[PDB]
Every structure is written in structure tokens, then in C-alpha cells.
Design a protein around this ligand. Sequence first.
Ligand SMILES: Nc1ncnc2c1ncn2[C@@H]1O[C@H](COP(=O)(O)OP(=O)(O)O)[C@@H](O)[C@H]1O
Ligand SMILES: *SCCC(=O)Nc1cccc(Cl)c1F
Ligand SMILES: [Cl-]
Ligand SMILES: [Cl-]
Ligand SMILES: [Cl-]
Ligand SMILES: [Mg+2]
Ligand SMILES: [Mg+2]
Length: 265
Amino acid sequence: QWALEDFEIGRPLGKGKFGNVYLAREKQSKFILALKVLFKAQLEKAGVEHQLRREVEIQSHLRHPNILRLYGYFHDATRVYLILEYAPLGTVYRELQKLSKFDEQRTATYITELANALSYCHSKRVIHRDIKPENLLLGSAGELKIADFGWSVHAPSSRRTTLAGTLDYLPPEMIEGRMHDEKVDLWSLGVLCYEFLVGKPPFEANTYQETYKRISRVEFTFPDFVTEGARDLISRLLKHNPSQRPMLREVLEHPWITANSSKPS
Ligand SMILES: Nc1ncnc2c1ncn2[C@@H]1O[C@H](COP(=O)(O)OP(=O)(O)O)[C@@H](O)[C@H]1O
Ligand SMILES: *SCCC(=O)Nc1cccc(Cl)c1F
Ligand SMILES: [Cl-]
Ligand SMILES: [Cl-]
Ligand SMILES: [Cl-]
Ligand SMILES: [Mg+2]
Ligand SMILES: [Mg+2]
């Protein structure tokens, strides 16, 4: 139905490994959206056609306040275009660069919004597996929305797709190429909570080889300013054994979360 001629393209919004994303306006309605442009040659070479389909499958059917909407799609023989909800306050990645560190209220509120969205997905045994700040977007009232569901699978799962950039948000069972389930997202929530308070993730290292070792051996420490309550929650999430990490319900009722979040569970 939609074609490229139906849109006026504008401000570049961001670049991922595959997605080139631009502000755009539909001519007849004046509707503002984010147009995510993918190159067919690149998708084919990397073998990630199935990730494009998964992203369309999940995000086109949902209507959750903390998950980014996908409205539709079209294509033209060199490119595929995804028509996305525009997030006008940008990425959490950009916001952390701006502020350097988040206070406890902002942090606990974001973790609440993340746990609300992921609780919905886990109830369907869907695991995201790629929760990192560049994939977390902000709505007009500063509310967090999870995006980029291309890596998502139903649990339990193995891995057949090659890992890309950083290891920093992935748990031991994922980097070691073992069977995995919902608890992968709980580990990543712990990594985020640390990174939001401290300004860098807990296993950050200057080589890939060293990052891998730090993750596999769960080697992290806290700076002096991180409070007892935040240490308790992060320590519960960053457990080597997935079965020992809490359920999202238990995160949402943790005393430090309920004391500091400005949003309810
Ligand atoms: N709906 C959106 N609104 C505003 N910016 C966006 C939106 N979607 C993506 N971006 C920007 O584009 C970048 C890449 O988009 P993403 O969907 O993650 O592509 P990839 O699948 O290639 O990682 C994001 O990290 C963000 O900077
Ligand atoms: S992740 C939240 C829930 C969800 O994924 N629902 C859904 C919608 C459409 C298709 C499939 Cl497989 C789904 F799981
Ligand atoms: Cl499809
Ligand atoms: Cl350390
Ligand atoms: Cl353990
Ligand atoms: Mg991305
Ligand atoms: Mg993607």
C-alpha cells in the first residue's frame, strides 16, 4: 500500500548495524513518524531476514505504553522500510551521555517501566535478549519504550545467529553459547541498573577477551556512592546461575524500587 512517494523525509534520527532511521511526514495526513531504512543486500549478506520478520511480527500487533509501536512496512527492490512510532525525546543512551549518571529516582523509575514491559513479554515466554540503552526510547512525556525486537525468541532457546558488537549486556549462558530462557533479560536489567547509577556498565573492559572473562566470572565491584539498597538489587540480578535470579514481580516489589520509583507497577 504505502510507497516512498507518500513521505517527505527529514532529520536523521540514528544508525544501528542495519537500520538507518529518519524523521518523516506522511503527505496527506501530515502524520509524523520514524522511517527505518534497511538495505536488502546487507540483510541477505548477514543472514538476518528472520530478524526483520520477527521485529514486524511482534511490534505490529502489540499496544503497550512501554513498547514501541510499528505501524506498517513497504519495500522497493534495494530497500525495506519500517514505519515506526516516533519517540521525540530520543534514546536512553543519548540521555546518559548528556547527564553522565542518573539519580536514584530516575533509575528506579526506568527499571519499573522496563520490568512492566518485560513482564508482559515473559508471560508469553518471549525473551528480548538485546536490552541495551540504544534500544530504549523516550516518549513525549519522558516515558520509556522498548524497541528493536529483532533478536527476540520464544523460550527456551539456543543461539544460531552470530553475536555482533559489545558483550556488555549479555549473561554467561549467552556468551558461552548455552541453552537460555527468560532469565537472560533479568541479567541485562541488572547491568542497566548499575550503568544508570554509575555511568558505565559493570563488566566494562578494554578488550573483548577481557570483557568475556569478567562476565563469565561475574567480576564486578561498586563505587562508594552506590547505596545499600541499590547494591542489594543489582547483586540479586547479576547471579551466575539463571535460576537464582528473581522474577520480574519480585523486582517490582523490591524495597529500593518502591521507595524511589515515580511510577507504579
Ligand atoms: N522510533 C524512533 N524514534 C527516534 N529514534 C529512533 C527510533 N527508532 C530508532 N531510532 C534511532 O535509530 C537507532 C537504530 O534503530 P534500531 O531500530 O535499533 O536499528 P538496528 O535494528 O539496526 O539496531 C536507534 O538506536 C535510535 O538512535
Ligand atoms: S513481547 C509481548 C507480547 C507478544 O510478543 N505478543 C505477541 C504478538 C504477536 C505475535 C507474537 Cl508471537 C507474540 F508473542
Ligand atoms: Cl513479514
Ligand atoms: Cl572491578
Ligand atoms: Cl550463582
Ligand atoms: Mg538497535
Ligand atoms: Mg535490530
